[PDB]
Amino acid sequence: TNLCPFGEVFNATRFASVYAWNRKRISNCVADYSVLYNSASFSTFKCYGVSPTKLNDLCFTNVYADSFVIRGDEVRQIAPGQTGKIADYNYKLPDDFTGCVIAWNSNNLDSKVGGNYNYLYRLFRKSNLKPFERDISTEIYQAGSTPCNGVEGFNCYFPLQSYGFQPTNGVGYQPYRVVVLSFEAPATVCG
């Protein structure tokens, strides 16, 4: 009857880039969802397959909390049946997704004046990612018939770019902290 450590995921001082996304495992604890929901500090809080106000009265065998930082225009891609560089090459939800996605503007925390190139995304891949796949590979991407062998140049590029987050960026171009709650034997996470 211990509480769930959600405050350790959301209120974490620093997050991870979307291509190396984080996954916390939640078990053997109780969670008050509508308290996060009544928080009213988020810009997006959209679930699928269930209701946010009915959440408190449910259980699951396991709950997974996935967190990263993307860009305002790309939050729309963290949803079932979506396309784009983030949805295809970084983080994909299955069509039968039965969870919630949460986001808020984080320009205050995650953008440096000269430029905070700490956050990265995958830009060049040969095929989309499976649902909940994670690709950390930094192998040089081969766009030509001639192979690369870990040497950049023509037809051989680094598959990762950096987000350019400046405080003067456009709102769509600002950094947004995202959290995803997946819902899934006896149950250990209730309310």
Partner: protein
């Protein structure tokens, strides 16, 4: 990605010593460099980390007042300076990277 440190150091008590930690392969100011200490017959012990952009160091309790993390972004080189060496500071010293809170301590 590569990390190569400086050579062994013999010093008397009260002396000082500066270890270096060159890197190669990636963008040096993108990621965090942190230090770990392994005394003889003990476990690993986390010392702290320095932000490679802002320079802000963080010292875990016990490594404050005589230890200095520093950088030279002109040569992608992290450094560890210890003032007023004691006999008990005898240990192996590792520099290491942090992809993320996830990829924490991936390269040594």
């Amino acid at each position: 990605v590569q990390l190569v440190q400086s050579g062994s150091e013999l010093k008397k008590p009260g002396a000082s010593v500066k270890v270096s930690c060159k890197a190669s392969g990636y963008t040096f100011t993108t990621y965090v460099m942190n230090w770990v200490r392994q005394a003889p017959g003990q476990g690993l012990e986390w010392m702290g980390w320095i932000n490679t952009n802002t320079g802000n160091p963080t010292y875990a309790q016990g490594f404050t007042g005589r230890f200095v993390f520093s950088l030279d972004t002109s040569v992608s080189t992290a450094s560890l300076q210890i003032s007023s060496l004691k006999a008990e500071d005898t240990a192996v010293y590792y520099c290491s990277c942090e992809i993320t809170t996830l990829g924490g301590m991936d390269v040594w």
